[PDB]
Point group: C2
Chain length 181, copies 2
């Protein structure tokens, strides 16, 4: 388990600050709940502090670049973290399917092993959150499923193909299995 | 390392929610960064999920009681979590030293080992935060810190001695001891 270094504490503070007005979809929960959860999931599988920090910051460029842009990211955490985060910042294609296929194509071929690990943690927590929401609110949550089953199934297979079996894609599989049931 | 369970996820969201507009003193950093840092620290030393949850929620009753009270803490996370968080409550004395004396007395005997551990993670992250600010803003923050550095050194070194006596050299006490000596070197470098 990585120790809480000055650099890691700075990333934790930056993630909270940059997303301070950012909310998880469907409620009022501050978005940093998700970022911290992704970092926590990554800490069980890597020693790479750059990977933990890019986990904390992997949505900043996409979702709050008015608060924290790529230049600031690099000046605070260096070029490697900025490249990891930029691997995961997906371009604005119009069609959902098109964006999904483009993410999945990149994930299977171009993305670094480090990027695939973060993406596994990212998608795992998102699916964990979906399952929590379904249990709390019920089958009507979908109006806000078969597409989602395909999406997380595809992420799970690509994660296995690129990384082999590990603690993160293990849990993603368990979540996909519940989702299928 | 504990898995991220539905209950731990709910604690994570609850801590971020209750403190959503709470900011750490001296800056603009949302307070939840302290809470998750404390939980991450606790996750390196215990597998007790109630302790991780109490770590996430340990400042709710004190700092944002209008957002989240003890009845709700118990409804959401059960009586053991609520008891753990309430173990850290302060005496209602205007005097900082009197409150500090009472809290240390409690930590040394009456507090559960679990509450000592949570308090250790809390004090450790707070001292780490002080040291971070001293290294990045040593320009003028040391001016503000000089007048109370004696209080700070006493406070953190006393918490450290009690934590060590009750818990031994776990990972958090190894780090806390170091941070206390680092605080001393910072006082030393400024006297030199
Ligand atoms: Mn994400
Ligand atoms: Mn605290």
């Amino acid at each position: 388990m990585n120790t809480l270094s000055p650099r890691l504490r700075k990333a934790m503070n930056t993630a909270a600050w940059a997303h301070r007005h950012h909310v998880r979809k469907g409620g009022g929960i501050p978005y940093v709940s998700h970022l911290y959860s992704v970092m926590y999931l990554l800490a069980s599988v890597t020693n790479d502090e750059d990977v933990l920090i890019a986990g904390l910051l992997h949505d900043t460029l996409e979702d709050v670049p008015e608060e924290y842009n790529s230049a600031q990211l690099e000046a605070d955490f260096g070029p490697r973290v900025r490249e990891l985060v930029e691997e995961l910042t997906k371009q604005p294609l119009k069609s959902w399917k098109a964006r999904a296929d483009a993410y999945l194509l990149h994930l299977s071929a171009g993305a670094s092993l480090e990027a695939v690990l973060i993406s596994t943690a990212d998608k795992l927590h998102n699916l964990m959150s979906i399952l929590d929401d379904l249990e709390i609110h019920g089958e009507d949550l979908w109006q806000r499923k078969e597409q989602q089953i395909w999406w997380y199934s595809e992420v799970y297979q690509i994660s296995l193909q690129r990384l082999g079996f590990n603690e993160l894609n293990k849990q993603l599989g368990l979540c996909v299995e519940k989702l299928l049931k």
